[PDB]
Design a protein around this nucleic acid. Structure first.
Lengths: 117, 55, 150
RNA sequence: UUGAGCCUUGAUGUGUAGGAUAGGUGGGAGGCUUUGAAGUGUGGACGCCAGUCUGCAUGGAGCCGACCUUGAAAUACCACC
RNA sequence: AGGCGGCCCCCUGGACGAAGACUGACGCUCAGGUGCGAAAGCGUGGGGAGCAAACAGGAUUAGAUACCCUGGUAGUCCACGCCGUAAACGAUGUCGACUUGGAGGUUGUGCCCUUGAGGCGUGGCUUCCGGAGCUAACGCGUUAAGUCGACCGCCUGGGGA
């Protein structure tokens, strides 16, 4: 139950939800928060108004692990992809590294051609 | 077209984002971006360069 | 449209004092007799100072601190989408909006005397105990989700 | 390696006022702890923020009673729950 | 033609330049033939991430059998074998000569110690803007719907069909 004080964090932001995880370098998820957790419907869940109020709800999910130094990984296009990071910095945590890992389309299967209006 | 197997040279033309440096930025003619894309493909199929990026 | 005349700047009074007290004796004027409110202004405070606050000097300060609108709600549309939207209120007249919500209820309620119809209203206003405020808050609470847009 | 039950063992335990966290309870001056007490907190649980346990910073045989004084009742040493 | 982008190794049609040469009208077109296929479809055996007819739901609505959302088989892929049709479209049959351009791309190549980065030329293919001419009009415009000739394929109002 001593604090670990060092680790990693993973950010996901899609066009329909922001999902943030505080992780371990072994690939474990230690605590999580979702922007649909604020009760908001549809693409609201991808805005800073939703993503900025998931960060300290994610810091609450590791309250017995104890955090201080974090290395961040970020994926997805959603607007909330950085306000959730600044809100976590403003919670009293210190970012050791920031890296973007958003995929570049490879094969991609089938796209909308043929796109909804 | 020339020296495309040297990766210590080729890494001056490709980004940390896993992409390519524009010909506007290297100051080069349009067909140098084709020469560069061919160098990239000819380094990929020779085990000199990776095919993809991400952590 | 955009013009519209420039909105007014009101006035203070050489006896009633501040711009809001000069508004209190001029708002909700009916029948134009203009001698009724000068016996009701700062005259409901001596019992308020022993019911829902202290002193005749803070009895009306606290009423416009307990009745404090910070957000307005209104419909907004953009083509084929409509939302109820929340907007922060401008501070400069904020306490005059709160004043209006008290002096009108003394007219819209008809129970015993006018020497009671405002004093009985103010003693709940100095406590944020207005009519149906739970369902009023339920609209602003529902509109909060629309500051996240679509 | 562990699901489940069961044995085994430790921390407990206070208010109020005063030194004093007396759990209950039956005896009671030479007997006991070395895989253990101190520090008093960094930090973990609980909290009267004191203290104890997990485990350290850490050491490492002691200690305790008189005078003083609380209370039905005592504070080494030793059962029982 | 329809269509076709990877790197790497074979097999291969056609077109095109430089400087010459050997045949001697051997050319141009073409009914019916003789051979091609994009999507979809039919056959025999495999295949199944993503997309999705059909289908079953959510709905929505007056109703929803559909849009929109949740799932989803056929079909898409391959061994091949069939099918022969298209807004197969710059809606312009094939073939040849004559003749204002500009801007630009793409590929050979003649020449000046290329002492050559440069400059002066010159064939092939081809995009956009447009002039004389043509056209009802828009467009075609030296890659002409122009100027003129050889041959072939077609055709004489919709509604019905």
């Amino acid at each position: 139950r001593k604090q670990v004080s060092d680790g990693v964090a993973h950010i996901h932001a899609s066009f329909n939800n922001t999902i943030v995880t505080i992780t371990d370098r072994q690939g474990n998820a230690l605590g999580w928060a979702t922007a649909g957790g604020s009760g908001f419907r549809g693409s609201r869940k991808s805005t800073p108004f939703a993503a900025q109020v998931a960060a300290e709800r994610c810091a609450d999910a590791v309250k017995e692990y104890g955090i201080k130094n974090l290395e961040v990984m970020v994926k997805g296009p959603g607007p909330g992809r950085e306000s959730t990071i600044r809100a976590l910095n403003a919670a009293g945590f210190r970012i050791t590294n920031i890296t973007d890992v958003t995929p570049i389309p490879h094969n991609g299967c089938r796209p909308p051609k043929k796109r909804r209006v | 077209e020339i020296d495309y197997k040297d990766i210590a040279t080729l890494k001056n033309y490709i980004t940390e984002s896993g992409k390519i440096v524009p010909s506007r930025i290297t100051g080069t003619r349009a067909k140098y971006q084709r020469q560069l894309a061919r160098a990239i493909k000819r380094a990929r199929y020779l085990s000199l360069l990776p095919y993809t990026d991400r952590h | 449209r955009r013009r519209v005349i420039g909105q007014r700047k009101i006035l203070p009074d050489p006896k009633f004092g501040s711009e809001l007290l000069a508004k209190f004796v001029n708002i909700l004027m009916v029948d134009g007799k203009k001698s009724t409110a000068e016996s009701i202004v700062y005259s409901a405070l001596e019992t308020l100072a022993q019911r829902s606050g202290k002193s005749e000097l803070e009895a009306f300060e606290v009423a416009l601190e307990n009745v404090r609108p910070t957000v307005e709600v209104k419909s907004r549309r953009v083509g084929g989408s409509t939302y109820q939207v929340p907007v922060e209120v401008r501070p400069v007249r904020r306490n005059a909006l709160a004043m209006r919500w008290i002096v009108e209820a003394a007219r819209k309620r008809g129970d015993k005397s006018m020497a009671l119809r405002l004093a009985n209203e103010l003693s709940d206003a100095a406590e944020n105990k207005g009519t149906a405020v739970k369902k009023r808050e339920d609209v602003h609470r529902m509109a909060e989700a629309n500051k996240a847009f679509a």
